[PDB]
Amino acid sequence: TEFLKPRLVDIEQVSSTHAKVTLEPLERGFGHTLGNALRRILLSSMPGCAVTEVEIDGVLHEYSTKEGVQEDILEILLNLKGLAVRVQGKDEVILTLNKSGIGPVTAADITHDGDVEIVKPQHVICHLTDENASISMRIKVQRGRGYVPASTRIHSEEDERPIGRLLVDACYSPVERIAYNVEAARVEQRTDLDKLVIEMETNGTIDPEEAIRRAATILAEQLEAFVD
Amino acid sequence: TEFLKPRLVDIEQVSSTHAKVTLEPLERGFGHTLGNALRRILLSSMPGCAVTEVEIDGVLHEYSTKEGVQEDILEILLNLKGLAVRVQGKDEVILTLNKSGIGPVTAADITHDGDVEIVKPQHVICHLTDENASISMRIKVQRGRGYVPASTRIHSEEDERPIGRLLVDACYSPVERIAYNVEAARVEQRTDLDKLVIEMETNGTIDPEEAIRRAATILAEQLEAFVDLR
Amino acid sequence: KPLVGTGMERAVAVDSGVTAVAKRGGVVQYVDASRIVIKVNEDEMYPGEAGIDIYNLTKYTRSNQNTCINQMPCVSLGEPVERGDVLADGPSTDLGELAL
Amino acid sequence: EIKELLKLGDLPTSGQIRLYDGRTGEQFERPVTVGYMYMLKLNHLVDDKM
Amino acid sequence: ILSPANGEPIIVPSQDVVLGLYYMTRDCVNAKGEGMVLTGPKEAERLYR
Fold this sequence. Notes:
The structure is cut from a larger assembly and holds two copies of chain A, two copies of chain C and one copy of chain E. By secondary structure, chain A is of the alpha+beta class.
């Protein structure tokens, strides 16, 4: 055992959501081990809070329409996934949205509480062409883990839903994109060692370095039963 | 947040080399991550011993022949590359071989020191085909990791060696083949869990428990410089 | 050796005259890394001499394209040998088959 | 005849098997051929050109 | 990057890159995730991976 370990060289930040981190030099073939383990941990197994289940008045099914709304309801159910939320006390809670008149229905017009934080108040949901039209719905938000689509959930549930409950894809994990890359570096005589350049992009609720260290901690805490 | 940890459970020695190691429980998506991480770090970073210099008397270079020996000396070197020793205390030893008379010369009759364990004592080295023939050799055994050829060592070292030291390539790593497998486990009501099964094929020189513990150690040490700093 | 060949390995390896072929039948007497001494059968011995053949193999030697020519004994001690066999593989043969 | 041989040793008749990957541990999407070629050196070495 | 014999580009992608570009962009009739909706290319990357 004559191990070799790095000196974190660069973290060059592009915005509040983007980042890229180089790291150099690693023993030969230790680029891919670390890159791959981190990527799988980030995509599949982080915890977070997000919207799951919606109740809209006067809507029965995914195909219908409501007069006085510029969108379909498919556009609504896409605009309602990126709504980044932070819950600190509960494990699930319910929002209520109530609006009338002409104007874009931003996220600020929602009924907010003390223990729930919305991190992009400018986010759009729907438009209202007719000033004689109103909108009134209620939203269910839950805390979980990973990524879970809707077909799996509906196959799992045979419950006799009150006709009007629509189900969304969940996006619990707070990472938009991660991608690594491994290229060659040098130490005085040896031209084999590897530098690793990961490139990460998350929504609100988490600053990138925070995400990377929490993932690495998850993995080491898994391994802790062998070292000693 | 229903995190759960693995514990090393079962070891089942099929033979003196083959071995299967079970390991459970693992939450979904963690079979493959651990499986492939430590598959990649068992095949490249284990420490083991292998022969690295040979001195045989009355022979000057490795292209000659000898009186009453079946193989010519290149074959003796290529047979010595693959004997498996186990050294307890030191990091380099000198072993001695010496025999006379008709018959095959096997690895059994290396004049053992106090703390050198030879794994297979039925591995052939030479053949003697005349009643007057004799052979006497001095082998050196070291410790290290990875693959190290002879050209690198000859160009690095400034030391001077006589006419008669013969250099052998070294291949230190003991693990030969390794393959894992993820299966579905049984816990009281959690049907969500998994189990990992690693099957490992090596020569002697490594008891599998120690192999997996060393792998886990170096992985955690690598992650440590990757948690705290930023 | 090659795992898939066209049956005409053996003729090219023998008729190219680079492997040492037995001259008369017998039973091997003394095998070494650089010579083999064979003792002929009684039926093949004409009554002048004692009937031993001696083969001196040619160890490492230059080939006029600058490569290595050498020969390896292919029989053990004390096993019979019939006329026409091979007793020593050449530079690029294997038990009398062209293996390239 | 070649397929009778392949079926005598318990190997897939089609000739091609499933290969995983070395770096990521994932499976290649499609079956892949595997077999034993017989190949040669040639003496156009590099150490005589550079 | 334009040949002087006739202004046709001279960096056409050759023989192996084109097969990758041709195996990505094609359509099967049954595969999975048939007919669900996304929010951008990024969630398409996450789903495929």
